[PDB]
Amino acid sequence: NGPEIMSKLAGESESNLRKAFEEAEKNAPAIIFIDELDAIAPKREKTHGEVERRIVSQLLTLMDGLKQRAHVIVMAATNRPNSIDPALRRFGRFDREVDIGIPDATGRLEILQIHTKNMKLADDVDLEQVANETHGHVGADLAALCSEAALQAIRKKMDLIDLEDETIDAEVMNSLAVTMDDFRWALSQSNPSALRETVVEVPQVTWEDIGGLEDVKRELQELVQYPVEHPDKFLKFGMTPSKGVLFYGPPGCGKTLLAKAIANECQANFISIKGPELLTMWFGESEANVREIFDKARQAAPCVLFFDELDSIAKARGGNIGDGGGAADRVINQILTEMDGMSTKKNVFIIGATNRPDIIDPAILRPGRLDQLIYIPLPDEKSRVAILKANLRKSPVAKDVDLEFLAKMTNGFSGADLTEICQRACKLAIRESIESEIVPEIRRDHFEEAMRFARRSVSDNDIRKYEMFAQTLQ
Amino acid sequence: NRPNRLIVDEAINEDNSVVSLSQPKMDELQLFRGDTVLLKGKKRREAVCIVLSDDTCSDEKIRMNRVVRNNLRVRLGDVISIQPCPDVKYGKRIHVLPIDDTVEGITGNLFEVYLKPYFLEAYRPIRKGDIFLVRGGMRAVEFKVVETDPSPYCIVAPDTVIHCEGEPIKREDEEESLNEVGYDDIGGCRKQLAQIKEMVELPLRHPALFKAIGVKPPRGILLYGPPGTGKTLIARAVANETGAFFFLINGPEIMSKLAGESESNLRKAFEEAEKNAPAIIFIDELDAIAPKREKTHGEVERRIVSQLLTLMDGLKQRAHVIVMAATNRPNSIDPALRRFGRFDREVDIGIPDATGRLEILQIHTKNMKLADDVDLEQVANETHGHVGADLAALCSEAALQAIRKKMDLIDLEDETIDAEVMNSLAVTMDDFRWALSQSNPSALRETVVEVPQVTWEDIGGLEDVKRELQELVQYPVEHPDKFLKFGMTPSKGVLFYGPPGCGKTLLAKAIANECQANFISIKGPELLTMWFGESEANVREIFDKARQAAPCVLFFDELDSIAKARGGNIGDGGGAADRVINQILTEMDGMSTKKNVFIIGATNRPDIIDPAILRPGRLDQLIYIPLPDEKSRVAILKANLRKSPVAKDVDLEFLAKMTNGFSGADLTEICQRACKLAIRESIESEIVPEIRRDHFEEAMRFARRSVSDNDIRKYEMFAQTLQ
Ligand SMILES: CC(C)N1CCN(CCNC2CCN(c3cccc(-c4cc5cc(F)ccc5[nH]4)c3)CC2)CC1
Ligand SMILES: CC(C)N1CCN(CCNC2CCN(c3cccc(-c4cc5cc(F)ccc5[nH]4)c3)CC2)CC1
Ligand SMILES: Nc1ncnc2c1ncn2[C@@H]1O[C@H](COP(=O)(O)OP(=O)(O)O)[C@@H](O)[C@H]1O
Ligand SMILES: Nc1ncnc2c1ncn2[C@@H]1O[C@H](COP(=O)(O)OP(=O)(O)O)[C@@H](O)[C@H]1O
Ligand SMILES: Nc1ncnc2c1ncn2[C@@H]1O[C@H](COP(=O)(O)OP(=O)(O)O)[C@@H](O)[C@H]1O
Numbered sequence A: 001n002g003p004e005i006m007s008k009l010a011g012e013s014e015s016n017l018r019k020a021f022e023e024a025e026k027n028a029p030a031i032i033f034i035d036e037l038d039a040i041a042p043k044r045e046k047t048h049g050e051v052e053r054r055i056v057s058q059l060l061t062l063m064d065g066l067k068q069r070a071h072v073i074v075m076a077a078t079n080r081p082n083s084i085d086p087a088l089r090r091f092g093r094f095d096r097e098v099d100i101g102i103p104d105a106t107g108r109l110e111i112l113q114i115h116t117k118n119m120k121l122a123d124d125v126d127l128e129q130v131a132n133e134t135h136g137h138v139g140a141d142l143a144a145l146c147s148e149a150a151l152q153a154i155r156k157k158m159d160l161i162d163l164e165d166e167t168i169d170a171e172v173m174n175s176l177a178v179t180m181d182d183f184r185w186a187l188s189q190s191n192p193s194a195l196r197e198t199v200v201e202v203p204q205v206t207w208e209d210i211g212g213l214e215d216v217k218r219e220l221q222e223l224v225q226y227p228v229e230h231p232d233k234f235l236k237f238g239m240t241p242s243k244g245v246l247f248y249g250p251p252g253c254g255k256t257l258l259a260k261a262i263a264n265e266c267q268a269n270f271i272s273i274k275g276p277e278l279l280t281m282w283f284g285e286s287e288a289n290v291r292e293i294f295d296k297a298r299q300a301a302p303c304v305l306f307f308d309e310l311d312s313i314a315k316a317r318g319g320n321i322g323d324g325g326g327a328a329d330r331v332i333n334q335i336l337t338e339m340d341g342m343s344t345k346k347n348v349f350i351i352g353a354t355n356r357p358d359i360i361d362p363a364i365l366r367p368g369r370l371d372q373l374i375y376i377p378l379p380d381e382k383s384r385v386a387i388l389k390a391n392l393r394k395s396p397v398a399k400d401v402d403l404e405f406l407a408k409m410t411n412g413f414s415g416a417d418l419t420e421i422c423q424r425a426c427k428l429a430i431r432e433s434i435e436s437e438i439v440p441e442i443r444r445d446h447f448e449e450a451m452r453f454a455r456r457s458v459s460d461n462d463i464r465k466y467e468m469f470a471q472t473l474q
Numbered sequence B: 001n002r003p004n005r006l007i008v009d010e011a012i013n014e015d016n017s018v019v020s021l022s023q024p025k026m027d028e029l030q031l032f033r034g035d036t037v038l039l040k041g042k043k044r045r046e047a048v049c050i051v052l053s054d055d056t057c058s059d060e061k062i063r064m065n066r067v068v069r070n071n072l073r074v075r076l077g078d079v080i081s082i083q084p085c086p087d088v089k090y091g092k093r094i095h096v097l098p099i100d101d102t103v104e105g106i107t108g109n110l111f112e113v114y115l116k117p118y119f120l121e122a123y124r125p126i127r128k129g130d131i132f133l134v135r136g137g138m139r140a141v142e143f144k145v146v147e148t149d150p151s152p153y154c155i156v157a158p159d160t161v162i163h164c165e166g167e168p169i170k171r172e173d174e175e176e177s178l179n180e181v182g183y184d185d186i187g188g189c190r191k192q193l194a195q196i197k198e199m200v201e202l203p204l205r206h207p208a209l210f211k212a213i214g215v216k217p218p219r220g221i222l223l224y225g226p227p228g229t230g231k232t233l234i235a236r237a238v239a240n241e242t243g244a245f246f247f248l249i250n251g252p253e254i255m256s257k258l259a260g261e262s263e264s265n266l267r268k269a270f271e272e273a274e275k276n277a278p279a280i281i282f283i284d285e286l287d288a289i290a291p292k293r294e295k296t297h298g299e300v301e302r303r304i305v306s307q308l309l310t311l312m313d314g315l316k317q318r319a320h321v322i323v324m325a326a327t328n329r330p331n332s333i334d335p336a337l338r339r340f341g342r343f344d345r346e347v348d349i350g351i352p353d354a355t356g357r358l359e360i361l362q363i364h365t366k367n368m369k370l371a372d373d374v375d376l377e378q379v380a381n382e383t384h385g386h387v388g389a390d391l392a393a394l395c396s397e398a399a400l401q402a403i404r405k406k407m408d409l410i411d412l413e414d415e416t417i418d419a420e421v422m423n424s425l426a427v428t429m430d431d432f433r434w435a436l437s438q439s440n441p442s443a444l445r446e447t448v449v450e451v452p453q454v455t456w457e458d459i460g461g462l463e464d465v466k467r468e469l470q471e472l473v474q475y476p477v478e479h480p481d482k483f484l485k486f487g488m489t490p491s492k493g494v495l496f497y498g499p500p501g502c503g504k505t506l507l508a509k510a511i512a513n514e515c516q517a518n519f520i521s522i523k524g525p526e527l528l529t530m531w532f533g534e535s536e537a538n539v540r541e542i543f544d545k546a547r548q549a550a551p552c553v554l555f556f557d558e559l560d561s562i563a564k565a566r567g568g569n570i571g572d573g574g575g576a577a578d579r580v581i582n583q584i585l586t587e588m589d590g591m592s593t594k595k596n597v598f599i600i601g602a603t604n605r606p607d608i609i610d611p612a613i614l615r616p617g618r619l620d621q622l623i624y625i626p627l628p629d630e631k632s633r634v635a636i637l638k639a640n641l642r643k644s645p646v647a648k649d650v651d652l653e654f655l656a657k658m659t660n661g662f663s664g665a666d667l668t669e670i671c672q673r674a675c676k677l678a679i680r681e682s683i684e685s686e687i688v689p690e691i692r693r694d695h696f697e698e699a700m701r702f703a704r705r706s707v708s709d710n711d712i713r714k715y716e717m718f719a720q721t722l723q
Helices: A013-026 A050-062 A105-115 A128-133 A137-158 A179-186 A212-228 A231-236 A257-266 A273-281 A289-299 A314-316 A330-340 A381-393 A403-409 A415-437 A446-452 A460-473 B067-074 B192-205 B231-241 B263-277 B302-312 B356-364 B377-382 B388-405 B429-437 B463-478 B480-485 B504-515 B524-532 B539-548 B561-568 B581-591 B630-641 B650-656 B666-687 B695-701 B710-721
Strands: A030-035 A073-076 A245-246 A267-271 A302-309 A346-353 A373-374 B018-021 B037-040 B044-051 B133-136 B140-146 B220-224 B246-252 B279-284 B322-327 B345-348 B494-496 B518-522 B553-555 B598-603 B622-626
Touching: A013 A030, A013 A050, A013 B356, A030 B504, A050 B429, A073 A179, A105 A302, A105 B630, A128 A179, A128 B463, A137 A179, A137 B192, A179 A289, A179 B302, A212 A231, A212 A257, A212 A373, A245 A257, A245 A460, A257 A267, A257 A302, A257 A346, A267 B581, A273 A314, A273 A330, A273 B581, A289 A302, A289 A330, A373 A460, A373 B388, A381 A403, A381 A415, A415 A446, A415 B463, A415 B480, B018 B695, B037 B067, B044 B067, B140 B553, B192 B220, B192 B322, B192 B345, B231 B279, B231 B322, B231 B345, B263 B279, B263 B302, B345 B539, B356 B377, B356 B388, B356 B710, B463 B480, B463 B504, B463 B622, B494 B504, B494 B710, B504 B553, B504 B598, B518 B524, B518 B539, B524 B581, B539 B553, B622 B710, B630 B650, B666 B695
Parallel strands: A030 A073, A245 A346, A245 A373, A267 A302, A302 A346, B018 B044, B220 B322, B220 B345, B246 B279, B279 B322, B494 B598, B494 B622, B518 B553, B553 B598
Antiparallel strands: B037 B044, B133 B140
């Protein structure tokens, strides 16, 4: 127990930890499991105090002192790997590490199944709906979400009776059945927790969710899949594949979905670093956090590490006349440092995306970095029909509305501008449904009323800037 | 299934022996009311009380108070067999003795100081063998009834003789004293306390059930709030009303002890409280015992914290011990104390609010024998920043005034001053105002989280926009079944944009008031303080505070205030981003979905707003609050003037159309310019205080129009682009 050995007095604190490995010697094979290792060995060479110097040293001797008679495996848990003393990772101490990390949506279903298998659920709730609402919860939050929903129904039914003896009957508690109202109430009181932590997950968006962009879809699979699946071929010509890709184009044309969909296809982890996150390192002038983003990526491998909005810092300074400074700055510099320092291509693929390729530091684009520039342009009405169909595949749709016409009528829209319309009309349908009972379906006239507000984000002069940047790139 | 039909409940309406009982069935027991009725206690005890009707009582349960409850030895949530029988028989001269340690309150006549007003016109049925409470003269005491001539019970009238004794006797210790604090002695009507009820109901009122069924009851609970906000009340009054044994780990008491016997004293604390079950251990100043942030000067404190962590995890699932712990801020205590199984749930007690502060002022002055004039609601308004302890001090300080004034002029005293000689003292508004003058609050600095008092009426005009807010705010929570159908997620945000003074802040408060949601206003000087101090890490706690206050409306005033601080014409060379608005973006995207928290931004300058604010998943709905027209100007004028009384001759329809381009705030200037002059008249006339048509004419001489007409175009222009 991380703090149990701490609760003991000076000088008998070591006695209690050392006998721990001596006992577990005699039992073999055995796992010793130190939890809150950062309680017993949290020193970073910073180290207030006295006693703690000696608790850590004894542990180091103990972890090295494993005498190759018996088998003792020492598993140790901690919240962040930077927390524990650096001497604990040397060869023979804690050599392997595992990142357990936050569960993911279709991971959280199973935890909700294991904590409610005795509960005698209602039919309606399938737990998959709650699994979605739950992002930021961890297995302990979820075991608490269930126990809190189980304590609701006891409060409600049952004890109205008050009938009890030394043990309540097994069957008198059978009629209690946990309900969606109970769970929603429970979701309301969870208090998660882990919301702040970065998300590393196989993304749920697929190729279907992307209208258009067929060729670019092939080219990603080329860059991502062939070097790992056919390394025998790349070795033949001595050629090393590119680690990077830079997407460039107008806003809303599907650069982020295109990144997630190739990670989803490879069932790789996806890590999205968003422009506000690169801006927070820049305003806080802490770019030393770029390393752990990468370290996190290395641990999550195979992953696709995606940088949203990679010009966000160049805009923060400028982007017309800018600072007097050149294109370099502190955060994008560390991304360069940490790309070159990668241990070759090992399950980690980098994708940058930008609206403004003008203001991108041209050192980003160099060989061995994000070499492949792909231009994601505005859709045409073939890809607009596909984008419309791809958005509308979820919310049910009444057949009379015509999806081929809405396309060609919106001449210059980005993919996101078509989401505005689809969302403008689905809003009105909910607007009808709730006002009709105080027939909830989507109609051809809603996409007409939605269309009254239809706006085109990306002006036509800049399409030229993209094409111009693109028309230069040959 | 032929069930009796009685449940026991707290009773908010204030009564000595009166009961509410549900209208949805009055025919099952069928009591017309005012009819003497049985109440079945435990152990062989019974009670008699009078019944009244409440629209807002439940069909489920029964409002009754703490004197009836203690007699029966019933508790909250309990059920007592009940039966109507209408009959009652009169009685004589009921006989009375002091009960328990309490006494010496009354000198000489003790039924003049106590009895006469309460048995007067009441017909309070009074039992052999019960205790009841009479309030007055800055003290409370209880008179047992040992001997009553008729039995089992007697209704009382003032045709009977008056017998006196007045000599104390020890009350049985098994009894639960009525001075020990309970739900009613906790004021504020926060309703948050109801949340602690739901947590501690089953574990400590129903111990044997948790050995029958696998579930996890919460081991720890954190109360947090600034000092004096009643955190020790809540624990005392949960433990008192549930019968659990209250323990007390004095935050600095374990600290005052020496090294190595400091742990011995805390560890035996949980070992004792093991043997008593169910029990609440209440650690106050947890940040004294476990304030380490991994920063930690010293030695001993490392080991006090570790022992506590082991103790909090070491709860062995035999017995029930709940560990409640209070602290001033949740960031103060060690982060390992919140892991699963330690302190899992937290509660923010927080500062009371205006109509919350009334109840605290009622609970601390119910013995004081107040004057008529002061209703306490006026002082309740002046009091913002005070906490329950400030308010208990505001009352004790106003009670010590009147003693200083009247009374001791006499100097007449013996070993105990007579109970009646202190009756003539009556606390007065001058006493309270003097008291308000010397309070010294305290908590003024703390952010305010309150259901705002402004309503829809307070807003002239803006009818459509009023509907559209209810659409955005209310429909996703009330009809989630509908939004799920289309897979659509509602917007979390709204950005109000328009000229200054057109009612953007009132419009935000009024929708939070309607939902009776908490309202948190972050004002431009507060975003500027994070920016000059280049600490935007405080954006997280604003949001954390919002999450804890949920459902709330989190409103950002003046959200372009930082863009102005740099510029707003040519600005800095930098683009629209900066450190504080960046964290607001980070913390909006990081929200755990839409969970009772709605964000509203408001700006005068949409030009200089960082366009990343306006993106999907952020503050997507832009609503344009424009200048009023004379229909909405008539409504704004009427809405402002609904408070200050107005003499009918002044014409409110004309003042409107004459002021052609005014913002809503510019009309407040005029209304305030004229109300000033009326006070100017009133005070100069006695050295006829009413408001006149000519004042709004003299007010109008100064009438100024803030928002120039060229910029209305900028708003319309920004607006005319937005389609
Ligand atoms: C037929 C099927 C049933 N079999 C099982 C499923 N596999 C799918 C094969 N998917 C592979 C493995 C995961 N991928 C992946 C994930 C994450 C990153 C990378 C990656 C990093 C990287 C770095 C470079 F420098 C160059 C290329 C890179 N690719 C690859 C590549 C495709 C099929 C057989
Ligand atoms: C008939 C009446 C007697 N019944 C009792 C009173 N309720 C009033 C219903 N009020 C609801 C609940 C509180 N509201 C509230 C308060 C604070 C925030 C939000 C909120 C957050 C949020 C986030 C989003 F992303 C989207 C929408 C959101 N709304 C809602 C919504 C209306 C009626 C029945
Ligand atoms: N090609 C496309 N196929 C399907 N949906 C699209 C496409 N392009 C844009 N969208 C829609 O518009 C929104 C914005 O797209 P996004 O992936 O953020 O592009 P970018 O990252 O370039 O802004 C997405 O949520 C998506 O639903
Ligand atoms: N909300 C409240 N309602 C009624 N009385 C209060 C309230 N808050 C404080 N008081 C009174 O003032 C004192 C508050 O002190 P305390 O209980 O120690 O609060 P805390 O635990 O927050 O320090 C109590 O003795 C109580 O009598
Ligand atoms: N539509 C309105 N209805 C009622 N009062 C208004 C209205 N618009 C402005 N006022 C008055 O003018 C003052 C300024 O309004 P405020 O809510 O601060 O608007 P903003 O936040 O846009 O400046 C308020 O105190 C209010 O009394």
